[PDB]
């Protein structure tokens, strides 16, 4: 009842990639139970960024996942207290980007506070030379670990000319709600398609959309 059919969000983001500091803010809305959302983003400090904006995409919203098949919803359950997440994304060419995030609910609006720290993105690689074209769809595996959930995914970043640069995500999701007030899910999977809808001014304005649907494995079992 705290998370309604349509929800708005406001976001603040600050961090560094290699040696370059920046801040963003964003606002948007979506449908938490249908698992769709839109964010309109502004780089408000340090723009234009010297790196492809694509590497920030996953840092801009776990409340908007359609949890199907009765999967207990760790994220929606966490309100009013909210939750946090922390992640390491490792690119196969040396870039590493960590991020920590706080998610709260204030006067009916979701509030995100995110911090980014990326290092060792190769100065002559596709991210620094802006040869990227957004992400392929992906499937994240989530599983309970230590009272929270952990997530694992490999994502494919499309490159100019075809071809991909791969990265791996390891995420820890922590609820701010007491564990005895949470019904934990078993292992499940989130199918996701994160898409750049619009951009302008050398990526200092960006519009992103995501659709995300959670499910069990639907293959028959011999056991």
Numbering used by the authors: 3 to 62, 66 to 228
Q: What is the paper's account of this structure, in its own sentences?
A:
They are widely used for studying biological events, such as cellular trafficking and endocytosis, and have contributed to the development of innovations such as multiphoton microscopy, genetically-encoded sensors, and super-resolution microscopy. mKate, a derivative of eqFP578 from Entacmaea quadricolor, is a bright, monomeric, far-red fluorescent protein with excitation and emission peaks at 588 nm and 635 nm, respectively. Using a structure-informed approach, we introduced a minimal set of two mutations in the chromophore environment of mKate. The first mutation, S158A, has been shown to destabilize the trans conformation of the chromophore, whereas the second mutation, S143C, was intended to impact the cis conformation.
At high pH (pH 9.0–10.6), this variant appears blue under ambient light, with absorbance and emission maxima shifted to 598 nm and 646 nm, respectively. In the structure of far-red-emitting GmKate (pH 10.0, determined at 1.8 Å resolution), only the cis-conformation of the chromophore was observed. The absorbance peak at 598 nm is indicative of the anionic form of the chromophore, similar to the state observed in mNeptune. Indeed, the π+-π stacking interaction between R197 and the chromophore is conserved at pH 10.0, and may further stabilize the deprotonated state of the chromophore. In contrast to mKateS158A and mKate, GmKate has a ∼10 nm red shift in absorbance and emission maxima at pH 10. In the chromophore region, the only difference between mKateS158A and GmKatepH = 10 is the loss of a hydrogen bond due to the substitution of the S143 with a cysteine. The loss of this hydrogen bond would thus increase the HOMO energy, which results in a decreased energy gap between HOMO and the lowest unoccupied molecular orbital (LUMO), causing a red-shift.
